[PDB]
Amino acid sequence: MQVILLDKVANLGSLGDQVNVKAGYARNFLVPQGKAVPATKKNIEFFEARRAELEAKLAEVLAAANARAEKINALETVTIASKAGDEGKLFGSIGTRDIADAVTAAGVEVAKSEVRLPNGVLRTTGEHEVSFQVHSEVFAKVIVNVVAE
Amino acid sequence: KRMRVIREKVDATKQYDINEAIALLKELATAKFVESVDVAVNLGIDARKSDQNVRGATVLPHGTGRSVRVAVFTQGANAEAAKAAGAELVGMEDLADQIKKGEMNFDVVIASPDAMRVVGQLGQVLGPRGLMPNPKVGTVTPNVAEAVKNAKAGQVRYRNDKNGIIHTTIGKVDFDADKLKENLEALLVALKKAKPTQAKGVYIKKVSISTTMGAGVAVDQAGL
Amino acid sequence: SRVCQVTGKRPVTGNNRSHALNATKRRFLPNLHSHRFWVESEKRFVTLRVSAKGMRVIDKKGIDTVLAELRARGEKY
Amino acid sequence: GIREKIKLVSSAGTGHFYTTTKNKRTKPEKLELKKFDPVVRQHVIYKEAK
Amino acid sequence: MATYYSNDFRAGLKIMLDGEPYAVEASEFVKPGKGQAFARVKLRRLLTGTRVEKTFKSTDSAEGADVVDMNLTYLYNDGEFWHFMNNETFEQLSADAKAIGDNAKWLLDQAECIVTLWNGQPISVTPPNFVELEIVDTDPGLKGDTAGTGGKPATLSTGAVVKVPLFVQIGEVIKVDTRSGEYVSRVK
RNA sequence: CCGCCG
RNA sequence: UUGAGCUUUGAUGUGUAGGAUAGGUGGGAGGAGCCGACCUUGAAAUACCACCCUUUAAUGUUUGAUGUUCUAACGUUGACCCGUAAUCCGGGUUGCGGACAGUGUCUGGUGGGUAGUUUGACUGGGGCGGUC
RNA sequence: AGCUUGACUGCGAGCGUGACGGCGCGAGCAGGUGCGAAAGCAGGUCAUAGUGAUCCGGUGGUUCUGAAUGGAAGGGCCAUC
């Protein structure tokens, strides 16, 4: 292919290479999610001046915001006390909408989608570790203590 | 060493041509006495298919003379006729007492349709275990054995089966006219390609190396 | 019907010749597949029933280049 | 049927051939006849081929 | 080419259809008023031969096989294969373990066991009605009490096991039949 | 292990 | 995680009998040392080395064979929301599948489900039998 | 019983016989051989059955043609399957 990279892709590119990929990996993923541009006789000219200085840094300082979007809620400990069962066996499992709303209402305004779940949908009252991915390499460890009430 | 320089003149990356190392076969070896040549020829045979066996008789042109002792199993006038054809023990079941004793003095068993009742009935295992029979496939048993052994005493080298691909034949003494030997290896090709088992595989001749006895290596080509 | 949006491939006909040369009218069909294409300017999805060589054209040409050609042919997309 | 057909090929420079039959499974020695070759206009030896 | 029609062949006429040779054992040719003719043929498979029943119509039927059943002389064994010789023409012949099947015991040597060769190669070997063999592993059969036929089993030289009476020990060369496998008597 | 009947 | 292949570096074939710690055969008197054939042999007798079977491991292996993980193509005859007064359709979210399924072209198989057809002549009527 | 390859190539006046395709006989002519001292005989066998037309295709030979020209391919002819 003619793939010029707008971004750091984790196994092939270094922010501006010409990687020869399969065509389905270009149409469905890398082009619509901002990771690539086709380079057909104009975009090599459109990368030559204006992108390696300006647009190689407009994502880089928003990635230096990924260093600073994490410490907005620097406490990183969460008390959720929704409805539970009787001696364990939780009433209703806390999903990604309620984990984000436990963070959006107090702390980071990150959305639903960047909440990870290493151990399912938390069918248990207890102390739990919920990852908040903001960067492809910078992973958080914000503790969600599911509490019975 | 003494066996190390032998290894030094073997380049497996190059397939050598016709004229190249055949003239160098006295150079590729450090033999004490006078030796001979061998020829390796490979013919694609499946080991579990008996329809692909190649046996016969290769009359061979020109060089070596009467050096093969040949046994006779004939009757009639041919008990005294092939005595003019140079063979040593001409006869009958006198050579069946020697099968029972296990004697190594002959290499070839040639008979007639008179003598087709002896080795097919008395020397059964001991004639084909080491292989020395005759029928209507090899040229072993006609009834014209007089003019048969006027040449088969001289130059016949028996193209025989192996379980795998290999059909190793024998080159002559090193001190002949070696250019004619490149026909003596070539006028076995047109007889091996003369008639096969009509069930050959991919190739006919894959690998061919004409060794001397123990030291020479010359990669022959199946094409040229 | 079974028509490519991009290249206009409709089903042609042809014979199904056998080993005894028996002719029988079959119908060649195009390798159609409704793909949901990304337009960077419109910032949305356009669902086109392209053929498989029609995706090859949008691999060379722009998606916006091909959509302007549909707009010239009275295509609603 | 049994008596198959062979091809006597001339031992001269040309490729004129006589064709004939030979019962192979009774007398399997080859034919070495001496026939007339109309390309050479001589009477050279012919030899069996297929 | 030797094509056959089903109203022709009697018995033993070896035919070749569906990739296998067949011997016809018998065939009953019937045809009835207001019907066509058919021959309910009792065939015999030749390579794996148990039996097969086909009811051919009057047309068509099969090509024949090169199927010569001549006398061969067992003379040799090596690895797997078993070599044979004609006492009329002295041509070579090589049988296989699939062709020897369930009869690798019964030959000893110089036996005139017939074979069926199919298309220039043998697939079957028929050992004779009797062969004489030697017992190498048999218990020294003692009477003891036994009032009522003692019958001890004997392992033979060819790796066969037969049931023998109590007076043959080891080196008592005994002849058996091959069609069943029973002791018949003792050769002396 | 085998061993029927007068 | 793997399965068979090549140039390739080489180690590796243990009973009958020959002192045994014999792969096959065609050659068969070669390497402070010492065999070998001769002989004892078996169904084949060994040195020397050849072409190789049959195992082993290294690499570039051609690669396929499957088998988890993921989501973005794709599917959804799952919930909700909107067009919308609409158990259609479209879009928007979300869940579950997921590079499977499905489809196009080429291709092997099966295929009286279906279609076009063939099924000879003489004959003391025709069939049968016989014959050409 | 000996020697042998005439079971040879190019033709062939003249008839015989078939509706035709075809089939049969043939002295002689040229070239080259065999046998016989020679005259001579020999282009299969005592004669009469032992067999299939075309089309399509296979192999060998021959520059006879060879789609601009030079080759070749493919055709043709000849021997054949």
mmCIF file of all heavy atoms in Angstrom, chain A residues 3 51 60-61 73 76 84 91 95 100 106 110 112 115 118 122 132 134-135:
data_model
loop_
_atom_site.group_PDB
_atom_site.id
_atom_site.type_symbol
_atom_site.label_atom_id
_atom_site.label_comp_id
_atom_site.label_asym_id
_atom_site.label_seq_id
_atom_site.Cartn_x
_atom_site.Cartn_y
_atom_site.Cartn_z
ATOM 1 N N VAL A 3 0.754 3.748 2.492
ATOM 2 C CA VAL A 3 0.286 4.199 3.793
ATOM 3 C C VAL A 3 1.348 5.070 4.457
ATOM 4 O O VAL A 3 2.409 4.585 4.858
ATOM 5 C CB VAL A 3 -0.091 2.991 4.664
ATOM 6 C CG1 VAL A 3 -0.348 3.394 6.086
ATOM 7 C CG2 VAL A 3 -1.332 2.353 4.095
ATOM 8 N N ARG A 51 3.349 18.480 7.757
ATOM 9 C CA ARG A 51 2.934 17.487 8.733
ATOM 10 C C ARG A 51 4.038 17.036 9.669
ATOM 11 O O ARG A 51 3.748 16.737 10.826
ATOM 12 C CB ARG A 51 2.354 16.248 8.040
ATOM 13 C CG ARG A 51 1.039 16.464 7.312
ATOM 14 C CD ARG A 51 0.555 15.148 6.726
ATOM 15 N NE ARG A 51 -0.675 15.260 5.950
ATOM 16 C CZ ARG A 51 -1.222 14.246 5.291
ATOM 17 N NH1 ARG A 51 -0.643 13.054 5.316
ATOM 18 N NH2 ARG A 51 -2.342 14.422 4.605
ATOM 19 N N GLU A 60 1.201 14.934 19.477
ATOM 20 C CA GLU A 60 2.241 14.711 20.472
ATOM 21 C C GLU A 60 2.032 15.525 21.742
ATOM 22 O O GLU A 60 2.400 15.067 22.828
ATOM 23 C CB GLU A 60 3.610 15.033 19.854
ATOM 24 C CG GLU A 60 4.831 14.765 20.709
ATOM 25 C CD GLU A 60 6.115 14.985 19.937
ATOM 26 O OE1 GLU A 60 6.035 15.332 18.741
ATOM 27 O OE2 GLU A 60 7.204 14.808 20.525
ATOM 28 N N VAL A 61 1.432 16.713 21.639
ATOM 29 C CA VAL A 61 1.150 17.489 22.839
ATOM 30 C C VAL A 61 -0.190 17.107 23.450
ATOM 31 O O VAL A 61 -0.428 17.392 24.632
ATOM 32 C CB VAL A 61 1.209 18.995 22.538
ATOM 33 C CG1 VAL A 61 2.602 19.376 22.051
ATOM 34 C CG2 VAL A 61 0.148 19.389 21.525
ATOM 35 N N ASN A 73 -7.962 13.063 38.406
ATOM 36 C CA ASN A 73 -8.317 12.350 39.630
ATOM 37 C C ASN A 73 -7.069 11.576 40.047
ATOM 38 O O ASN A 73 -6.861 10.420 39.680
ATOM 39 C CB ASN A 73 -9.518 11.438 39.410
ATOM 40 C CG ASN A 73 -10.096 10.902 40.706
ATOM 41 O OD1 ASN A 73 -9.608 11.203 41.794
ATOM 42 N ND2 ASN A 73 -11.148 10.101 40.594
ATOM 43 N N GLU A 76 -7.447 8.286 42.788
ATOM 44 C CA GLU A 76 -7.428 6.984 42.112
ATOM 45 C C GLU A 76 -8.012 5.864 42.979
ATOM 46 O O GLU A 76 -7.644 4.695 42.833
ATOM 47 C CB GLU A 76 -6.012 6.631 41.633
ATOM 48 C CG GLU A 76 -5.472 7.584 40.563
ATOM 49 C CD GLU A 76 -4.033 7.295 40.157
ATOM 50 O OE1 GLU A 76 -3.390 6.425 40.782
ATOM 51 O OE2 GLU A 76 -3.543 7.948 39.211
ATOM 52 N N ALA A 84 -26.563 -4.640 46.564
ATOM 53 C CA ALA A 84 -25.858 -5.913 46.607
ATOM 54 C C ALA A 84 -26.795 -7.026 47.065
ATOM 55 O O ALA A 84 -27.981 -6.808 47.321
ATOM 56 C CB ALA A 84 -24.639 -5.826 47.529
ATOM 57 N N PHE A 91 -26.209 -8.161 43.774
ATOM 58 C CA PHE A 91 -27.507 -7.944 43.135
ATOM 59 C C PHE A 91 -27.349 -7.647 41.648
ATOM 60 O O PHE A 91 -27.791 -8.420 40.792
ATOM 61 C CB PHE A 91 -28.219 -6.788 43.846
ATOM 62 C CG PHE A 91 -29.602 -6.495 43.336
ATOM 63 C CD1 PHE A 91 -30.680 -7.267 43.734
ATOM 64 C CD2 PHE A 91 -29.828 -5.427 42.476
ATOM 65 C CE1 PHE A 91 -31.958 -6.985 43.278
ATOM 66 C CE2 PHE A 91 -31.100 -5.146 42.009
ATOM 67 C CZ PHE A 91 -32.165 -5.928 42.411
ATOM 68 N N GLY A 95 -21.562 -2.129 35.373
ATOM 69 C CA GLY A 95 -21.009 -2.034 34.039
ATOM 70 C C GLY A 95 -20.268 -0.731 33.803
ATOM 71 O O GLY A 95 -20.173 0.139 34.670
ATOM 72 N N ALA A 100 -17.758 4.660 34.716
ATOM 73 C CA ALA A 100 -17.454 5.989 34.196
ATOM 74 C C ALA A 100 -18.209 7.078 34.950
ATOM 75 O O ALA A 100 -17.627 8.123 35.258
ATOM 76 C CB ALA A 100 -17.775 6.052 32.702
ATOM 77 N N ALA A 106 -17.139 12.939 39.487
ATOM 78 C CA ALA A 106 -16.139 13.468 40.413
ATOM 79 C C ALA A 106 -14.760 13.065 39.896
ATOM 80 O O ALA A 106 -14.329 11.926 40.099
ATOM 81 C CB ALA A 106 -16.374 12.958 41.829
ATOM 82 N N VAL A 110 -13.443 11.584 31.497
ATOM 83 C CA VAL A 110 -13.283 10.561 30.466
ATOM 84 C C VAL A 110 -14.608 9.821 30.260
ATOM 85 O O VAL A 110 -15.459 9.733 31.156
ATOM 86 C CB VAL A 110 -12.133 9.606 30.847
ATOM 87 C CG1 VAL A 110 -12.500 8.709 32.033
ATOM 88 C CG2 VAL A 110 -11.612 8.801 29.646
ATOM 89 N N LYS A 112 -17.262 6.654 28.602
ATOM 90 C CA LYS A 112 -17.535 5.249 28.889
ATOM 91 C C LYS A 112 -16.453 4.326 28.341
ATOM 92 O O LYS A 112 -16.000 3.413 29.037
ATOM 93 C CB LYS A 112 -18.891 4.871 28.287
ATOM 94 C CG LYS A 112 -19.249 3.403 28.379
ATOM 95 C CD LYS A 112 -20.638 3.145 27.816
ATOM 96 C CE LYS A 112 -20.675 3.308 26.305
ATOM 97 N NZ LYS A 112 -19.909 2.248 25.606
ATOM 98 N N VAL A 115 -12.781 2.954 29.728
ATOM 99 C CA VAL A 115 -12.757 2.141 30.935
ATOM 100 C C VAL A 115 -12.504 0.699 30.520
ATOM 101 O O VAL A 115 -13.256 0.139 29.717
ATOM 102 C CB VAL A 115 -14.077 2.263 31.708
ATOM 103 C CG1 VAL A 115 -14.086 1.327 32.893
ATOM 104 C CG2 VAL A 115 -14.310 3.699 32.142
ATOM 105 N N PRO A 118 -10.465 -5.859 33.508
ATOM 106 C CA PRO A 118 -9.596 -7.038 33.411
ATOM 107 C C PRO A 118 -10.258 -8.315 33.902
ATOM 108 O O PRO A 118 -9.820 -9.416 33.557
ATOM 109 C CB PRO A 118 -8.402 -6.669 34.300
ATOM 110 C CG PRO A 118 -8.446 -5.187 34.417
ATOM 111 C CD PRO A 118 -9.909 -4.844 34.415
ATOM 112 N N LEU A 122 -17.606 -7.299 37.160
ATOM 113 C CA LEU A 122 -17.565 -7.107 38.614
ATOM 114 C C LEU A 122 -18.858 -7.570 39.288
ATOM 115 O O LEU A 122 -19.646 -6.776 39.797
ATOM 116 C CB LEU A 122 -17.240 -5.653 38.984
ATOM 117 C CG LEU A 122 -15.874 -5.117 38.558
ATOM 118 C CD1 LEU A 122 -15.718 -3.661 38.980
ATOM 119 C CD2 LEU A 122 -14.750 -5.982 39.102
ATOM 120 N N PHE A 132 -7.777 2.435 33.384
ATOM 121 C CA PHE A 132 -8.244 3.538 32.549
ATOM 122 C C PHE A 132 -7.158 3.810 31.519
ATOM 123 O O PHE A 132 -6.131 4.422 31.832
ATOM 124 C CB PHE A 132 -8.549 4.780 33.379
ATOM 125 C CG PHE A 132 -9.766 4.651 34.243
ATOM 126 C CD1 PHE A 132 -9.945 5.492 35.323
ATOM 127 C CD2 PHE A 132 -10.721 3.681 33.993
ATOM 128 C CE1 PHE A 132 -11.053 5.377 36.130
ATOM 129 C CE2 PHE A 132 -11.829 3.562 34.795
ATOM 130 C CZ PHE A 132 -11.997 4.410 35.861
ATOM 131 N N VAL A 134 -5.694 5.830 28.657
ATOM 132 C CA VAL A 134 -5.753 7.108 27.960
ATOM 133 C C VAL A 134 -4.766 7.183 26.810
ATOM 134 O O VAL A 134 -5.032 7.895 25.827
ATOM 135 C CB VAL A 134 -5.548 8.294 28.928
ATOM 136 C CG1 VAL A 134 -6.726 8.401 29.882
ATOM 137 C CG2 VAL A 134 -4.260 8.138 29.721
ATOM 138 N N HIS A 135 -3.657 6.452 26.883
ATOM 139 C CA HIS A 135 -2.671 6.385 25.818
ATOM 140 C C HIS A 135 -2.442 4.913 25.513
ATOM 141 O O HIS A 135 -2.774 4.043 26.321
ATOM 142 C CB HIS A 135 -1.372 7.102 26.226
ATOM 143 C CG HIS A 135 -0.367 7.231 25.124
ATOM 144 N ND1 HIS A 135 0.622 6.297 24.906
ATOM 145 C CD2 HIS A 135 -0.211 8.171 24.161
ATOM 146 C CE1 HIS A 135 1.353 6.662 23.869
ATOM 147 N NE2 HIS A 135 0.867 7.794 23.396
#
